[PDB]
Amino acid sequence: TCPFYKKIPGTGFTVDAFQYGVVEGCTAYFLTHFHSDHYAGLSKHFTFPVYCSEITGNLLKNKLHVQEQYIHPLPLDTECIVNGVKVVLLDANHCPGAVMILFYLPNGTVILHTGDFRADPSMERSLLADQKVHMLYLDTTYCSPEYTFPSQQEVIRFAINTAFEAVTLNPHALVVCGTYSIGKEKVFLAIADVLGSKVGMSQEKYKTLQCLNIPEINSLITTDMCSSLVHLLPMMQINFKGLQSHLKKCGGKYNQILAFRPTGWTHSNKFTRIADVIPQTKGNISIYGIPYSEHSSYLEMKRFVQWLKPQKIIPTVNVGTWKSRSTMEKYFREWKLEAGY
C-alpha cells in the first residue's frame, strides 16, 4: 500500500509509486528520475500513463521496455496541463533526467516535490522565483549538520589532478571507476578527457549512457576495452580481489591500477579535507573513495528551504524511524525561527 508522502492531495497523481500495484484513484504516475528505489515496479507490462523527463522516458523505453504509448515525456521549464492540472518540471541537479515537479492545484495551493535533488542557489532564479509554495515534499537524505562534503567542482579537480599525475609517472597504469546506476558521469568523463582516452565499458552500460542526451557522447565512450585506458566496472568489483582479476584480463598491457569509488558521504568527511584524501593501497593497486554527492549537503538544504519559505514540509527520506523524524522536525523549526517565516 502506497504511503501518504507519495500522494499529491487534490489530484489523481502519485510520485515514484510503481511498487504498490494499481493505486486507488491514480490517473497519472509521475517518475522523478531513473534510480531503482524510485522506478521499482515498472516493466513492459505497465499500462498506465507515466509522466517524466525526455531522458527518463528514453531509459524507460530502452532499459525497462515500457511501451511507447504509455510514456509521456515533458519539456523542462514549461507550463503543461496534465489531466486538468498545471504542472512544471524543473532540473533537480541530481542524475541525468532528474526533475522536481511543481503542481498548481485547482484550489490555489502550490506544491513542490523535489524528487532527489542537490540544492543550488541557481534554483532561486528558476520558475520558483515567481510564486508562493505552500507544501514542500523534501529530499532529506543528509538532513543533519554532520553531513558536510565539498563542491562537485573541487572533487573533480582532485580526481583529474590525481589521475593525470599517476599516468604521467607511469604510462602503463590503468584507471578504473566504479558505477551501479546513472549519475556521477562527470567523474569518469573528466578523467578520460585529461588523459586523451575514451572510456571503456560493457555493452549494457554503453546502452544506458546512449539514452542520456550528453553532447558529443560518441566521441567520449566505447565498448572496445583494449583501446581505452579508463575502464568502468560495477561498484562491487572495486576492491583488491576484483581489481587484481581485472588486471589479469588486460593481457600485460598494464602493471598498476588506480581506482575511484564515488560514494556519497562517509564519516572520513568529519575529519579530512578533500586535499588531504589518501587511498587504500595493496601492492600495485590503489583505491580512492571520493565524496562526490548528488544530494544536498545540510547547509545547501537549509539555504534552499529558508529561501523558499514553505508553509509545510513533508520529508521523503529517513521517514522510517521516530528518532530520524524527530531530528528532522527539530531542524525545520530551527530554520523557520531563525528566518522568521
Nearby residues of 38 by Cβ (< 8 Å), 6 or more positions away: 16, 18, 31, 32, 115, 116
- Sequential DSSP letters for 143-174: -STT-----HHHHHHHHHHHHHHHHHH-TTEE
Pairing of strands 280-282, 285-291: antiparallel
- The answer to whether 35 contacts Ni ion (rule: CB under 5 A) is yes
C-beta closer to Ni ion: residue 117 or 158 = 117
Q: Is 6 in the site for Ni ion (CB under 5 A)?
A: no
In the list 59, 92, 116, 147, the residue contacting Ni ion (rule: CB under 5 A) is 116
Cell 528505489 -> residue: 37
H-assigned helices in 170-291? 185-195, 203-210, 240-249
Amino acid at 174: L
For 202, residues 6+ apart whose C-beta sits below 8 A from its C-beta are 223, 232
Number of residues that bind Ni ion (CB under 5 A): 2
96 vs 200 by CB, closer to Ni ion:
96
Q: 183 or 200: whose CB is closer to Ni ion?
A: 183
Q: Which residue has the cell 573541487?
A: 154
Region label for 115, one of left (φ > 0), alpha (ψ between -120 and 50) or beta (otherwise): left
Burial class of residue 214 in the structure, from the number of CB atoms within 10 Å of its CB (0-12 exposed, 13-18 middle, 19+ buried): middle
Q: Smaller CB distance to Ni ion: residue 15 or 287?
A: 15
* Shortest spacing between CB 33 and Ni ion, in angstroms: 6
Residues 248 to 277 in contact with Ni ion, rule: CB under 5 A: none
C-alpha 231 chain-centroid distance:
21
Shortest Å distance, C-beta 95 to Ni ion: 6
Minimum Å distance from CB 316 to Ni ion?
11
Q: Closer to Ni ion at the Cβ: 116 or 300?
A: 116
CB nearer to Ni ion: pick between 139 and 173:
139
DSSP state of 50: E
In whole angstroms, the minimum distance from the beta carbon of 146 to Ni ion comes to 21
Written as nine digits, the cell of 124 is 532561486
Q: Select the span of 74-82, 111-119, 213-221, 258-266 touching Ni ion (CB under 5 A).
A: 111-119
Q: Which is nearer to Ni ion, 212 or 220 (CB)?
A: 212
- Least distance from Ni ion to the Cβ atom of residue 211, Å: 16
Stretch that binds Ni ion, among 34-42, 56-64, 140-148, 167-175 (CB under 5 A): 34-42
Could you tell me the smallest distance in angstroms from the CB atom of residue 143 to Ni ion? 15
Q: How far is the CB of 26 from Ni ion (least distance, A)?
A: 22
Q: Which stretch binds Ni ion (CB under 5 A): 30-38, 44-52, 230-238, 247-255?
A: 30-38
* CB 92, min distance to Ni ion, A: 9
What's the chain's length in residues? 341
| Residue 139 sits in the site that holds Ni ion (CB under 5 A) | no
Kindly calculate the radius of gyration of the chain based on its CA atoms and give it in whole angstroms: 22
CB atoms within 10 A of CB 22: 8
| Identity of the residue, 97 or 289, whose beta carbon is nearer to Ni ion in the bound complex | 97
User: Of 68-76, 110-118, 199-207, 215-223, which part binds Ni ion (CB under 5 A)?
Assistant: 110-118
Q: Which amino acid is residue 23, in one-letter code? A: V
Residues that bind Ni ion (CB under 5 A): 35, 116
